[PDB]
């Protein structure tokens, strides 16, 4: 049984976890925003032939804006807007653009329902296709897998970027949840006067249900009565009443996430090292430019390397999700001598991320044994520390260099101790060789080993210099 677990006992972190048995395989976290793509029933306040556009009271203290290019044929009893829409005439409206400075919000009757994989436009069939970002090979199957969906005649569809690695049956499951929603949309509207909200475009539960409900999900356990009932409303309004029987209140004293043992794996998304089933590990270091992943073996050399890399490919994949790693990612797989092992390790990472929602690109193992890849984002320092002694002689040589300059040290405590005792001879030797030059070595308890300043040049006291 795969379950969605939702924890909201804590006001400042709403947590959503997809869990297969007890194995965490996805996580979404939302701490304490915009009003766009929201669907309402609005009343036509006033019309203007002057702007070929009308005004719609969808419920905001400001009235929205409905151009003639957005009035659907379904609403008509080139034209003037005076011929199409009457005042007080109800209409199903979606925000096309937010409120800007003054009370301006642009609307459309041409509604769109964006799911995980598909964007249904039940209102105009003149829309549809594969996302522009998809390309030659990645998109090819799609247009085919696209054609095989069962789309009602009067509407058109778009395949999203997340649709790159999904199957025909998985796309079908999306299109249905979209249609179910659209049926709830136009029904919560036929049953009421003007105007009032239907689809909250983006509250977190709407998203979790939008993005995460696959047929394989058995239960949705929510540990908050106040939230659970909002979710029922959210499931019903989200068109799919039936999952309503499968949302169940969590009542156990042991907090939801602790009872399913996931509180620790959630913490693993922070861990730098992650153990692979066969004993090996991946190390995930992040740098300025990119994220780098190294892979060590557990404890046939060719078989071990191969099996370890394959186990890594899987773990990397799920770690890419839990961590929500964005941008450039470089993987140092354990070296493999046969080309096909490389091909086989590659194809996996390909297969392992097929279910991730983000846009992912993966290149081949370079001759150095590196796999460059990238991942679309869905949503520091302390450096070895140089010896005191080694650091001291460094500074000492740096002071001397400053003492030589024509027209001519703030160090951590034990550096100053080392310099002004163990190296007093050399410090003296500088001042005597550089006649007239004062070498002020002030210890500073506000600093430490790593750090210092050698400043080149008042009747100020040595210990009052760090402040100056
Ligand atoms: Zn450090």
Residue numbers in the entry: 1 to 32, 35 to 79, 87 to 308, 314 to 393, 402 to 404, 407, 412 to 436, 441 to 489, ...
Q: What does the published report state?
A:
RNase E is an essential bacterial endoribonuclease involved in the turnover of messenger RNA and the maturation of structured RNA precursors in Escherichia coli. The N-terminal half forms the catalytic domain (residues 1–530), resembles its paralog RNase G, and is relatively conserved among prokaryotes (Marcaida et al., 2006). The RNase E catalytic domain forms a dimer of dimers, with a quaternary organization resembling two pairs of scissors arranged in tandem.
Quaternary structural adjustments may occur in the binding of intricately folded RNAs, such as M1 RNA. However, the complex between the N-terminal catalytic half of RNase E and M1 RNA has one tetramer per RNA component under saturating conditions, as shown by native gel electrophoresis mobility shift assays and by nondissociating mass spectrometry (P. Ilag et al., personal communication).
